[PDB]
Paper text:
Overproduction and aggregation of IAPP leads to amyloid deposition in the islets of Langerhans, a pathological hallmark of type-2 diabetes. Although the precise link between IAPP aggregation and disease remains uncertain, IAPP aggregates have been shown to be toxic in cell-based assays, and genetic and animal studies implicate islet amyloid in the progressive loss of pancreatic β-cell function. Over 40 different proteins, with diverse native structures or in many cases intrinsic disorder, form amyloid associated with human disease, yet all amyloid fibrils share a common cross-β architecture consisting of a continuous intermolecular β-sheet supported by networks of zipper and ladder-like interactions. Amyloid fibrils have a similar cross-β architecture, but fibrils formed by a single protein sequence can have diverse structures, varying with time, self-assembly conditions, and sequence modifications.
Cryo-EM was performed on fibrils assembled from 30 μM IAPP in the same buffer used for kinetic assays (160 mM ammonium acetate, pH 7.4, 1% v/v DMSO), in the absence (4 replicates) or presence (2 replicates each) of 50 μM YX-I-1, canagliflozin, or doxazosin. Fibrils with a similar morphology were observed for the control (no small molecule) and doxazosin-containing samples, with the majority having a twisted ribbon morphology and crossover distances of 60–100 nm. Each protofilament is formed from a single stack of L-shaped IAPP subunits, with straight β-strand segments encompassing 13ANFLVHSSNNF23 and 25AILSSTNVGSNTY37-NH2, hinging on a turn at Gly24. In addition, further flanking subunits presenting U-shaped IAPP subunit conformations and ambiguous β-strands were observed adhering to these two β-sheets, with the combinations of these flanking subunits differing to generate the three individual polymorphs LL, LLU, and LLUU. Thus, out of the fibril structures that were identified in each data set, YX-I-1 fibrils consisted of 89% C-fold subunits, whereas this subunit fold was absent from fibrils grown in the control or with doxazosin.
Residue numbers in the entry:
A (entry chain R), B (entry chain N), C (entry chain J), D (entry chain F), E (entry chain B), F (entry chain V), ...: 15 to 37
G (entry chain H), H (entry chain D), I (entry chain L), J (entry chain P), K (entry chain T), P (entry chain X), ...: 16 to 29
């Protein structure tokens, strides 16, 4: 058998910025 | 058998910004 | 047998902004 | 047998903005 | 047998804005 | 049997910025 | 005393 | 005393 | 006393 | 007394 | 007294 | 005086997909 | 004086999809 | 004086889909 | 005086995908 | 008294 | 006087993917 | 006087992927 | 012969 | 012969 | 013969 | 013969 | 014969 | 004969 187990107990803050390109 | 288990117990804050491109 | 199990117990705040492009 | 189980017990706030493009 | 089970016990606030484009 | 186990108990802060290119 | 067998749903006892 | 067998739905006991 | 067998769902007892 | 056998889900007892 | 056998999920007892 | 001038003479194809999140 | 001038001479195809979330 | 001028000379095709959420 | 001038003469193809997160 | 056998998940007892 | 001039004469293909996170 | 001049005459292909994180 | 003075709009002559 | 002065609109001559 | 003075818009002559 | 003075816009002559 | 003075925009003559 | 004075933009003659 195959078992994928993910357990998260903490706060996560993710910020992603893509852009600001001048052509 | 195959078991995918996802467990999240914490606050998650995600911000994504795409754009601001001048052509 | 195959088992997909998703369990979320925490607050989630997601903000997505796409745009602001000048041509 | 195949079992998809989704369980959400927390508040979710999602904001999506698309637009603000000048041509 | 195949079982899709969705269970939501929390408040959900979704805001979507599309538009504000000048041509 | 094969077992993938991921356990996170700490706060995670990730910031990603891609862009700011002038052509 | 709560006994649950083959629980695929969400069970909430208070 | 709550006994549930083959529960695929949502059970809420208060 | 909480006894759970073959629990694939989410069980919340308070 | 909490006894869990073959628990693949999330169990929360408070 | 908490006894867990074959626990693949997340168990939280408080 | 202040002059904002935007001139677009080419075809623009924009595709945006937001979603497909399981909780 | 202040002058905002927008001029578009090309075809524009925009597709936006928001949704497909399971709770 | 203030002058907002918008001029569009090209075909525009916009498709927006919001929904398909299961709770 | 201040002059912002944007001139685009080429085809632009932008694809943005945000999502596919399992909690 | 906490007894855990074949624990592949995360167990948190407080 | 201040002059911002942007001139683009070439095809631009931008692809952005954000997501695919398991918690 | 101050003059910012950007001139692009070539094809640009940009691909950005952010994500695929397991917690 | 096309003469345009202070053109803020779009002028198309064919 | 097309002469336009202070054109803020769209002028189309064919 | 095309003469343009103070052109802030887009002029297209074909 | 194309003469342009103070051109801040886009001029296209074909 | 193309004469351009104080050209801040894009001029395309073909 | 192409004469350009104070060209800050892009000029393309073909």
């Amino acid at each position: 058998f195959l078992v994928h187990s993910s357990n998260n107990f903490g706060a996560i803050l993710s910020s992603t910025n893509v852009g600001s390109n001048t052509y």
